[PDB]
Amino acid sequence: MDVFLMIRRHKTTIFTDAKESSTVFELKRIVEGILKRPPDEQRLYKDDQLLDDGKTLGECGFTSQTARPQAPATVGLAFRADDTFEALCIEPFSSPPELPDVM
Amino acid sequence: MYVKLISSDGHEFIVKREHALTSGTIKAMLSTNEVNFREIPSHVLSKVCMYFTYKVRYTNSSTEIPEFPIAPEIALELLMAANFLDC
Amino acid sequence: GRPRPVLRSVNSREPSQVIFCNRSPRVVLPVWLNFDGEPQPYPTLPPGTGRRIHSYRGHLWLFRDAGTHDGLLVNQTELFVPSLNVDGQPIFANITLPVYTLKERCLQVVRSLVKPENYRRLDIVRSLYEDLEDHPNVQKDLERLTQERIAHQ
Amino acid sequence: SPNYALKFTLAGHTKAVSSVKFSPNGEWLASSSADKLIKIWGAYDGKFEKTISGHKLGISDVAWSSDSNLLVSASDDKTLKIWDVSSGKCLKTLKGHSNYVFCCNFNPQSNLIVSGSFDESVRIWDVKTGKCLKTLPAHSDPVSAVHFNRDGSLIVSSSYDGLCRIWDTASGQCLKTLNPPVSFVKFSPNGKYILAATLDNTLKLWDYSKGKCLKTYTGHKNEKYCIFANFSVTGGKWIVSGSEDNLVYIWNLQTKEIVQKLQGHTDVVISTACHPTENIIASAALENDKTIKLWKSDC
């Protein structure tokens, strides 16, 4: 069961996939390859909830039904360097304009 | 290989190179592994990246394919993006 | 004497039992090409339903959205041709959405929201007006498939 | 060659005319129509005689009893009706088919009626009681024509299944079969042959006892409608049929040569009939025409 994700930090969004059976730790290894920060310098979140490295993505509620190619689920990302922890902060995307009269 | 696609308002989208190459326009712009769009905003470009994931996953797949959803409020700018991107 | 359309059913009179299986979210219109190549509409299939139907070997079928005539796929391709049943087993015609281009999907959505009279009230380039006005049509696919079949000759 | 010429046009129906039949005594012409009416005409002068009504949908076919006193009709309303010609009274409604009834005939004794239906059956009815006596189900597509032979011991039927079946009246069992849809069949007036039409612009004469095709008639257009053909034997010996090019074709029965084409109708000529004692042909045409024509010849 593939799961499709947006990993978001500040004004950065990574599109990637994993399995429901993938661990949170294994997702950090995916992020490491892209962003070059090791798993122990990463914190991953689902909404406000800090995710436990050992738990599977499925156990955290990312399923093939909630994390779809055309509507991926969001994972928050924050970094740590030594004793300094960054807080989770995700900049929202822009907003569409008013719906035109003839729609 | 990942590429970085940057929206008009500065949001960075990191996507598989194979996925971004769905668009011949992006392929040309890549010829850095980053592409700056001058008029595609983040809410549209994020929807375009979902399309790429959908297209690559469901192409050649010989399974039941779900609809690609588009909300009314985004449809007209997404159309313009799709036309520009030829995807 | 005259050419006949290459896309037309063969009058085999050899029965073939088929399951039309609508694996799309659309209401599906089955279209049968008759022996002269004219498209004939058959009863529609709601989403998530399937029906066992009687057709014939060498008959030609296509499948469209019943309301918009968007093109659909059948066993991952445009045309479905029944063959002989083997071992008492019906033949499945698995109808699904194609992977539309993002542009075509956007055109489908905008068409569903704007009356054709009002397309040119939208604030986009003229070529997108013409794109919106170019509605789906089984004849397009018949033309396109015929040209492709000629290019493999 | 005969010299048929147009004598009268009868313009009483308001939709396609499906069938014309001369009464065995020569006096009358019955017509049936998509307009749900039967009309009776003088056979010699085309004079309107009466309208006969009661069917709820269009009528495909009509046929006379041997004594010219009864008519049976076959309708889209799934029934047949037996009528008293003198009064116009519906004596019986024959209920049993489960879809349109296209064709009907009395046997020579006229104690039985045979019918053929879109429901792919041939049914045999008792005239006196109106009960269905037998249902003969072997055709696998609409039945286009049914006809008794000269002593009524055999029925011939034709069907879109491509087959002509000869049935034993008494038992109901099929005795013989004679590939495009067969649109018309009837026994010859002498009894030896069967005339069959198929939707490939072809009529064929069959020696059914021998199972052999003796003649083929072509030149006309018949690919869509079930067009009734006939034997003309009062003068010379001709085959007569309508056509989809709006003409009546007449062939020499032995040479298979076209000897006349009768011009005048403005739609498919679906029905032709030949008068039992004089050299008179009646023809009937579909929705762009809606008329009956009467034609007369010296031979």
Side-chain angles (χ1 to χ4, degrees), chain A residues 2-47 49-54 56-64 66-103, chain B residues 2-31 33-61 63-87, chain C residues 1-3 5-120 122-125 127-148 150-151, chain D residues 1-55 57-88 90-130 132-191 193-209 211-220 222-262 264-299:
Chain A
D2 302 333
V3 297
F4 297 82
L5 306 170
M6 269 183 308
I7 304 142
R8 308 203 44 211
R9 168 189 180 265
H10 293 187
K11 287 180 84 182
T12 303
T13 301
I14 302 173
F15 283 80
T16 193
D17 51 347
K19 315 326 155 213
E20 262 164 9
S21 69
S22 287
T23 64
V24 168
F25 180 88
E26 278 158 14
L27 185 56
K28 296 176 173 184
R29 280 288 185 202
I30 286 164
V31 167
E32 170 179 39
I34 301 167
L35 295 182
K36 301 330 202 205
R37 301 279 305 258
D40 68 337
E41 293 181 9
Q42 295 175 38
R43 266 171 296 138
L44 297 183
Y45 300 74
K46 183 166 181 313
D47 293 317
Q49 176 68 66
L50 178 62
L51 298 177
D52 159 6
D53 274 346
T56 67
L57 295 181
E59 286 168 10
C60 302
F62 304 104
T63 66
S64 298
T66 67
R68 297 177 298 170
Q70 67 279 6
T74 295
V75 182
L77 166 65
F79 289 137
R80 161 201 180 158
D82 290 310
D83 288 317
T84 299
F85 297 67
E86 139 192 292
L88 180 65
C89 182
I90 298 167
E91 181 74 357
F93 297 145
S94 50
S95 285
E98 169 164 32
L99 186 59
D101 274 355
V102 317
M103 281 168 87
Chain B
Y2 288 82
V3 301
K4 176 190 293 168
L5 310 178
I6 308 177
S7 71
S8 63
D9 59 322
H11 274 267
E12 289 178 358
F13 296 94
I14 301 177
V15 304
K16 294 179 198 174
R17 179 177 281 271
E18 165 189 11
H19 295 209
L21 290 186
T22 300
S23 167
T25 299
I26 295 177
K27 197 190 289 213
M29 290 179 98
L30 280 169
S31 325
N33 68 347
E34 66 178 53
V35 171
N36 285 264
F37 296 105
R38 315 161 77 226
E39 300 178 271
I40 299 161
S42 59
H43 71 288
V44 173
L45 186 52
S46 60
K47 192 72 173 192
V48 170
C49 293
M50 307 176 186
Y51 178 75
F52 294 154
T53 313
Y54 173 88
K55 189 277 199 193
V56 167
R57 173 58 181 90
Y58 288 117
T59 293
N60 294 331
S61 72
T63 180
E64 185 160 350
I65 290 162
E67 196 82 69
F68 189 76
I70 304 173
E73 301 79 5
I74 204 174
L76 200 70
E77 305 164 284
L78 196 58
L79 176 57
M80 294 161 62
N83 189 67
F84 179 75
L85 289 179
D86 180 48
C87 70
Chain C
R2 189 185 296 174
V6 310
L7 296 188
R8 59 184 158 102
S9 287
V10 178
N11 189 2
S12 73
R13 305 145 263 111
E14 298 177 51
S16 185
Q17 312 294 327
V18 170
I19 311 299
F20 287 176
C21 178
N22 183 3
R23 297 182 200 279
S24 92
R26 305 304 191 81
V27 181
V28 167
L29 174 68
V31 176
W32 177 58
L33 304 186
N34 75 13
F35 303 117
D36 297 324
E38 184 183 17
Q40 311 287 324
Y42 267 69
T44 57
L45 299 154
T49 74
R51 290 191 192 136
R52 179 193 254 251
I53 70 82
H54 186 265
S55 185
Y56 296 81
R57 182 190 177 188
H59 283 205
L60 259 70
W61 295 84
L62 301 96
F63 301 84
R64 314 294 291 199
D65 181 298
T68 69
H69 293 168
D70 303 319
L72 301 170
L73 296 187
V74 51
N75 295 341
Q76 285 66 231
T77 188
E78 288 103 327
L79 276 282
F80 173 69
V81 179
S83 44
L84 291 177
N85 298 113
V86 308
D87 189 23
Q89 277 162 105
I91 297 151
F92 271 78
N94 289 308
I95 308 154
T96 64
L97 289 179
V99 184
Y100 297 119
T101 64
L102 180 62
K103 180 173 180 195
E104 185 62 35
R105 185 62 188 130
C106 289
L107 291 174
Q108 289 173 8
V109 174
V110 175
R111 285 179 192 130
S112 75
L113 297 154
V114 187
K115 268 179 299 204
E117 310 89 44
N118 307 291
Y119 291 157
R120 300 204 177 221
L122 302 162
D123 185 21
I124 65 199
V125 303
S127 64
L128 283 173
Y129 296 149
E130 298 170 347
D131 290 343
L132 283 167
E133 293 163 348
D134 196 6
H135 289 170
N137 173 8
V138 61
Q139 292 288 348
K140 291 184 179 178
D141 291 280
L142 295 179
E143 176 61 25
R144 180 176 57 73
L145 290 176
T146 288
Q147 285 300 300
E148 289 170 7
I150 274 157
Chain D
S1 151
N3 56 350
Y4 281 92
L6 185 57
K7 296 307 172 191
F8 302 101
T9 300
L10 326 179
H13 290 286
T14 55
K15 309 169 112 302
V17 185
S18 56
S19 195
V20 283
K21 302 288 174 72
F22 288 106
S23 68
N25 69 13
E27 293 284 281
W28 309 107
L29 185 75
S31 56
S32 63
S33 176
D35 69 17
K36 324 174 200 233
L37 300 185
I38 299 165
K39 290 176 191 283
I40 310 290
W41 314 82
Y44 301 109
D45 61 7
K47 176 190 181 213
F48 178 65
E49 184 66 17
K50 83 178 66 174
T51 294
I52 297 187
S53 58
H55 277 292
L57 292 172
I59 306 181
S60 215
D61 203 12
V62 290
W64 296 86
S65 58
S66 311
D67 66 3
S68 304
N69 289 323
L70 298 177
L71 277 187
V72 62
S73 55
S75 173
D76 292 1
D77 69 15
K78 309 190 288 154
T79 74
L80 304 102
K81 289 176 178 291
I82 309 180
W83 310 88
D84 176 78
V85 171
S86 297
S87 69
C90 179
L91 304 181
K92 292 289 184 316
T93 301
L94 311 181
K95 295 174 109 93
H97 284 290
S98 52
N99 215 323
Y100 320 125
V101 191
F102 290 143
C103 50
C104 54
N105 261 310
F106 287 89
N107 64 343
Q109 197 188 328
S110 294
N111 69 306
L112 301 179
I113 288 158
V114 67
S115 70
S117 174
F118 181 97
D119 74 14
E120 314 180 0
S121 75
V122 170
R123 286 181 178 246
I124 307 172
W125 315 76
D126 192 59
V127 162
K128 166 171 148 178
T129 67
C132 191
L133 300 174
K134 294 199 170 61
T135 304
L136 316 187
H139 285 295
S140 65
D141 273 306
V143 180
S144 54
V146 288
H147 191 232
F148 285 97
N149 73 340
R150 180 153 73 140
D151 70 351
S153 64
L154 298 173
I155 293 162
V156 66
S157 64
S158 52
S159 165
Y160 266 54
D161 63 14
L163 291 192
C164 285
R165 286 182 174 265
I166 300 177
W167 312 82
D168 177 69
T169 300
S171 73
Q173 294 203 52
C174 185
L175 297 182
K176 193 178 306 192
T177 75
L178 322 185
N179 194 242
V182 196
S183 41
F184 168 81
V185 73
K186 83 173 321 200
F187 286 101
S188 66
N190 58 86
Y193 318 113
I194 280 174
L195 185 66
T198 48
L199 293 185
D200 61 2
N201 318 296
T202 309
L203 280 153
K204 281 179 188 173
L205 187 65
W206 290 80
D207 180 346
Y208 62 88
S209 294
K212 186 172 56 147
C213 174
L214 303 183
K215 306 285 170 183
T216 298
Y217 314 95
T218 67
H220 66 310
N222 191 19
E223 272 171 6
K224 187 176 187 325
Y225 291 96
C226 290
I227 298 184
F228 208 94
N230 302 102
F231 299 81
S232 184
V233 305
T234 48
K237 301 294 178 274
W238 323 114
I239 299 293
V240 177
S241 177
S243 184
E244 283 162 5
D245 59 7
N246 310 351
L247 303 169
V248 181
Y249 283 67
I250 308 178
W251 295 259
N252 190 305
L253 181 151
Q254 305 299 336
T255 73
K256 305 167 296 199
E257 229 56 49
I258 298 178
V259 290
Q260 250 190 301
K261 306 179 210 185
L262 316 183
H265 284 293
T266 54
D267 211 347
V268 174
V269 177
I270 191 109
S271 181
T272 60
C274 298
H275 188 281
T277 57
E278 296 303 324
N279 306 312
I280 310 174
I281 295 170
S283 58
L286 300 184
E287 310 74 24
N288 192 44
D289 177 313
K290 311 186 181 63
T291 69
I292 305 156
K293 284 169 189 281
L294 300 174
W295 321 76
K296 302 192 189 177
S297 166
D298 296 305
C299 70

